[PDB]
Ligand binder design. Structure first.
Ligand SMILES: [Mn+2]
Ligand SMILES: [Zn+2]
Lengths: 367, 330
């Protein structure tokens, strides 16, 4: 009962390029990939659900919560108006799985379900813990390297076809005796930077085009700190790949790369690239730590310094933080270090090492 | 035929099954790297240089008027006499099949710059495919391209995600292709009943010989040889195919040129569980077995092997492992 393929449903209109059988459960993830010795070698094994069938099983799993949420909003249990499901897509590599071999996990999380009652969208379900493994529902498990673009695309393209076809329909499904209608909004947000850059045809993380959301360059984003808008979008990237591949204005490779802003491969997954709370604290902490080092050596007053002088400043700051703050020094950045260093108390502590109090004012304001 | 191991530089990972090697003025080049091109080599085409049994891949640059083609696995490739290379079909890094045609030629050589121009196709354009053969025939002072066989995915009509990657043999139609203008003509032949992929093709004058291959529907590697004669009069050309006895059964074989009007083919796969260790010689046609070269134990016990022709009557081979192990058989 709890696995895909048990409940019946219908898609109106039927999903394009998707079989309509509803008894479908676990199917081969290679999705019929040719395995003859002549063909490309298949070094992977994969198993998946059919995407729609999985969403069906998920909704039927959470039926009790949906009905009780409708009651909790003073609505009628038997109401069947168009529910809207916002669904999070996530993909990550699970690193090494070997027992003594990498895996990729393709999953979806039900983020919220709203109902249309008047000109209002009533939130009848919302995931309380959206980043828990308890609600990241597995859709495809493959034994392969997230960096193996050929196998990754071969295994994931079928899932992308099923999703794109679900974008154009309404699922009718029988809940609590009453047939209900569901529309789906797919938001691909569970992609870390590397997987976004891979599946949206951008360059690797060393590139000059640092943002997955905008066209800036590392140099540009360091000179213009704040004023940028989100300009990338899956379609723009597809276009820019076609521009790269056809090179229609007959440019040099440098000029072409500048034109297409680092989109040098063909995207194949539409994502919503974002950032997480962690990396904000982290970027800020790295900059503040370097500011502390350079405020101890009075660089605002002395422009030049040897590497020895800089290592002695850092050692000074590390010893003082260990002594007065009981923060261990770390040789590589990390989350809770940022969490503990970004306090005004530590600004006081480091001010105990800075002679000039105008720079005490500067640091206190910055923090 | 002497076998020799080869070591590879830092970017050995670039070499993948279905890659292609092309020869320009003695200099060998490599195309069909793994993954999409990286900032170290934007073109994906590399000077393929073997010095003292050590292989260095050095990035090659494209000219200003060039298309930046994606790397393609199992394309149909042939040589055209300026001297140039024709690439049609193949698989992309995203598992997409290309139906476009690319033309590779040496644009400038400084101590090489390439021109890659894509030719559009109108008329009876061949459905996108990989594992197919393309060759140039010459009839009555006119040049025409002949293309046969291969595989592709199900049509957009019958394609279902559950079998999204399922492939089938193309219809065994012969395609005549005019490269100057980009026009394509499809001919149904009675002698060519079944589909064919991963076969070998030999082109002399107005004739193309089709050898071996794998027919997916029957799952047989038929032991047939097909001669295809092409006439290029003022009007529509005429194509006739004839069945020839004495055809070898081999898929994914590799072919090299030892001397004018004489070719040698090193093995491919003879059955799903078997490999073709023997070698064949073709004279323009008579097929004679040759003495099997001194295979090492690693090659003999490997289930998979892949390779390409370097041009100078020398084959470049690879076996699975270190990532992959490479040999040169001359
Ligand atoms: Mn990751
Ligand atoms: Zn940005």
């Amino acid at each position: 009962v709890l696995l895909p393929g048990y409940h019946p449903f219908e898609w109106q209109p039927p999903l394009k390029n998707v079989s309509s059988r509803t008894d479908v459960g676990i199917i081969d993830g290679l999705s019929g990939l040719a395995s003859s010795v002549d063909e490309y070698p298949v070094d992977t094994i994969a198993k998946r659900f059919r995407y729609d069938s999985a969403l069906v099983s998920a909704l039927m799993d959470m039926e009790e919560d949906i009905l009780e949420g409708m009651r909790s909003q003073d609505l009628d249990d038997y109401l069947n108006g168009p529910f809207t499901v916002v669904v999070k897509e996530s993909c990550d590599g699970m690193g090494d799985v070997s027992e003594k071999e990498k895996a990729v996990r393709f999953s979806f999380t039900v983020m919220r379900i709203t109902i249309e009652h008047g000109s209002q969208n009533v939130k009848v379900f919302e995931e309380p813990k959206p980043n828990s493994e308890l609600c990241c529902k597995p859709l495809c498990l493959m034994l392969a390297d997230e960096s193996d673009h050929e196998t990754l695309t071969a295994i994931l393209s079928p899932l992308i076809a099923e999703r794109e076809a679900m974008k154009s329909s309404e699922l009718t499904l029988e809940m609590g005796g009453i047939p209900r209608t569901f529309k789906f909004i797919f938001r691909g947000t569970g992609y870390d930077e590397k997987l976004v850059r891979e599946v949206e045809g951008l360059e690797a993380s060393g590139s000059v085009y640092i943002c997955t959301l905008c066209d800036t360059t590392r140099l540009e984003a360091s000179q213009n700190l704040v004023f940028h808008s989100i300009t990338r979008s899956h379609a723009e990237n597809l276009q820019r790949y076609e521009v790269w591949r056809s090179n229609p204005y007959h440019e040099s490779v440098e000029e072409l790369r500048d034109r297409v802003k680092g989109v040098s491969a063909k995207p194949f997954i539409e994502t919503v690239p974002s950032i997480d709370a962690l990396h904000c604290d982290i970027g800020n902490a790295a900059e503040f730590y370097k500011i502390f080092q350079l405020e101890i050596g009075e660089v605002y007053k002395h422009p030049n310094a040897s590497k020895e002088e800089r290592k002695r400043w850092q050692a000074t700051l590390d010893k003082h933080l260990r002594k007065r703050m009981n923060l261990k020094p770390i040789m590589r950045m990390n989350g809770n270090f940022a969490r503990k260093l970004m306090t005004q108390e530590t600004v006081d502590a480091v001010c105990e090492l800075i002679p000039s109090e105008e720079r005490h004012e500067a640091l206190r304001e910055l923090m | 035929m002497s076998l020799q191991m080869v070591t590879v530089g830092h970017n050995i990972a670039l070499i993948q099954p279905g890659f292609s090697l092309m020869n320009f003025d003695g200099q060998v080049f490599f195309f069909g790297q793994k993954g999409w091109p990286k900032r170290s080599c934007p073109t994906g085409v590399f000077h393929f240089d073997i010095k003292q049994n050590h292989l260095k891949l050095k990035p090659a640059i494209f000219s200003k008027d060039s298309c930046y083609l994606p790397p393609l696995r199992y394309p149909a490739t042939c040589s055209y006499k300026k001297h140039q290379y024709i690439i049609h079909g193949g698989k992309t890094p995203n598992n997409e099949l290309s139906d476009k045609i690319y033309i590779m030629s040496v644009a400038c050589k400084n101590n090489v710059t390439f021109r890659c121009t894509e030719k559009d196709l109108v008329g009876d354009v061949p459905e996108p495919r990989y594992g197919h053969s393309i060759d140039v025939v010459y009839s009555r002072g006119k040049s025409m391209g002949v293309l046969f066989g291969g595989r592709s995915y199900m049509p957009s009509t019958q394609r279902t995600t559950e079998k999204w990657n399922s492939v089938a043999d193309c219809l065994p139609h012969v395609f005549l292709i005019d490269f100057e203008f980009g026009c394509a003509t499809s001919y149904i032949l009675p002698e060519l009943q079944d589909g064919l992929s991963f076969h070998v093709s030999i082109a002399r004058n107005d004739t193309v010989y089709i050898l071996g291959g794998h027919s997916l529907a029957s799952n047989i590697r038929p032991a047939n040889l097909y001669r295809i004669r092409v006439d290029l009069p003022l009007g529509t050309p005429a194509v006739n195919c004839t069945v020839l006895p004495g055809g070898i059964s081999v898929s994914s074989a590799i072919l090299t040129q030892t001397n004018n009007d004489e070719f040698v083919i090193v093995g491919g796969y003879q059955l799903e569980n078997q490999k073709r260790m023997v070698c064949s010689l073709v004279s323009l046609i008579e097929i004679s077995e040759m003495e099997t070269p001194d295979w090492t134990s690693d090659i003999k016990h490997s289930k998979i092997w892949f390779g390409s022709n370097m041009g100078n009557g020398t084959i470049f081979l690879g076996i699975p492992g270190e990532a992959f192990y490479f040999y040169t058989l001359r």
